[PDB]
Amino acid sequence: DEADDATKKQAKDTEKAKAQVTYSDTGINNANELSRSGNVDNEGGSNQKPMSTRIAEATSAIVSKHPA
């Protein structure tokens, strides 16, 4: 994603449909590289249900009410 976006910005900034100094599809097998993503929270856990919703549910599972 980021490599393609950056090479496209390079093409636009050098005013040619085909870039010349690219960041993606180089000769190196850089296949283990990571990046920051919204999918991972700070606890090393998956971010599919947001932390606010997780806390709200975990707290709601313990609340009581008045007796009739």
Partner 1 sequence: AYIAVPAVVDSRSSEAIGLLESFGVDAGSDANDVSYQDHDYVVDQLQYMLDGYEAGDVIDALVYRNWLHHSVYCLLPPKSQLLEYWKSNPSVIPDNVDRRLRKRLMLKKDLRKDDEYNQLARAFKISDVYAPLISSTTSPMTMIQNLNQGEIVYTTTDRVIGARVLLYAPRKYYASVPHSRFNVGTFPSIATPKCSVMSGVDIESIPNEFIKLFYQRVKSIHANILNDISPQIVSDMINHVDVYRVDVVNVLFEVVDVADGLRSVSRKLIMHTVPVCILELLGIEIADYCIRQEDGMFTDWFLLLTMLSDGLTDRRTHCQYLINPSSMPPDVILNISITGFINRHTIDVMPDVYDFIKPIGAVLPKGSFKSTIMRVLDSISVLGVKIMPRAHVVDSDEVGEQMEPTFEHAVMEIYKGIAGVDSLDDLTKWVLNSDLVPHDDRLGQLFQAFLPLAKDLLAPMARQFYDNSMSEGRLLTFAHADSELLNANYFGHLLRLKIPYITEVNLMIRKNREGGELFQLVLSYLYKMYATSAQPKWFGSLLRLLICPWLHMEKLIGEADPASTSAEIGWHVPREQLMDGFIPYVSIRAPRLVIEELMEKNWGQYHAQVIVTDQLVVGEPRRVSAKAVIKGNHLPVKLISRFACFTLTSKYEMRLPCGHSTGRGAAYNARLAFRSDLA
Partner 2 sequence: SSEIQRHITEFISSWQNHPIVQVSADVENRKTAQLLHADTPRLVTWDAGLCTSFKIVPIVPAQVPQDVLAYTFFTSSYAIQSPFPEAAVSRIVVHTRWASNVDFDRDSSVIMAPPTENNIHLFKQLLNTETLSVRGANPLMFRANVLHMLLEFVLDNLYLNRHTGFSQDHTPFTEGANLRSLPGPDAEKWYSIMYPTRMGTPNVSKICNFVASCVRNRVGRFDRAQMMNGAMSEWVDVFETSDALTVSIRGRWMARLARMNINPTEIEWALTECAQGYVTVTSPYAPSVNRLMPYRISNAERQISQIIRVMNIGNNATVIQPVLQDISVLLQRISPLQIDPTIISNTMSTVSELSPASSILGKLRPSNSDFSSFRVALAGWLYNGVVTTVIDDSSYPKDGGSVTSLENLWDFFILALALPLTTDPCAPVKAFMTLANMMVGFETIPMDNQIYTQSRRASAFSTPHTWPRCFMNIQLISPIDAPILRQWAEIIHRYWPNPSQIRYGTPNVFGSANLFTPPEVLLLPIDHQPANVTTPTLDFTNELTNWRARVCELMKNLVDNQRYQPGWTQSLVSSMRGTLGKLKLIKSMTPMYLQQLAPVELAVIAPMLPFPPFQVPYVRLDRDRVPTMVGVTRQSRDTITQPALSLSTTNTTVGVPLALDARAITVALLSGKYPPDLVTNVWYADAIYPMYADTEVFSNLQRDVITCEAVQTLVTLVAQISETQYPVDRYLDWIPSLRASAATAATFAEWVNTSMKTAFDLSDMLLEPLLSGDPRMTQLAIQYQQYNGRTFNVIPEMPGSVIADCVQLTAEVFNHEYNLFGIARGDIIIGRVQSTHLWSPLAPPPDLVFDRDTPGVHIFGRDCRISFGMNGAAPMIRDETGMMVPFEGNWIFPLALWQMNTRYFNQQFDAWIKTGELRIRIEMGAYPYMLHYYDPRQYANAWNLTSAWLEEITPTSIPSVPFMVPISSDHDISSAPAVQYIISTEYNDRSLFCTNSSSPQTIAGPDKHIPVERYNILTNPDAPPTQIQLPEVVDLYNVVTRYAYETPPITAVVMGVP
Q: Return residues touching partner 1 (CB under 8 A).
A: 4, 17-18, 25, 48
Among 13, 15, 17, 68, binds partner 2 (CB under 8 A): 68
Q: What is the end-to-end Cα distance of the chain in Å, rounded?
A: 58
Contact 7, 19 (CB under 8 A): yes
In a 13 Å sphere around the CA of 66, the CA atoms on its Cβ side amount to 1
Chain-centroid distance of CA 9 in Å reads: 20
- How far apart are CB 68 and partner 1 at their closest, in Å? 30
Which CB, 46 or 64, lies closer to partner 1? 46
Chain residues that interact with partner 2, rule: CB under 8 A: 27, 29-34, 36-37, 40-41, 43-49, 51, 54-55, 57-62, 64-68
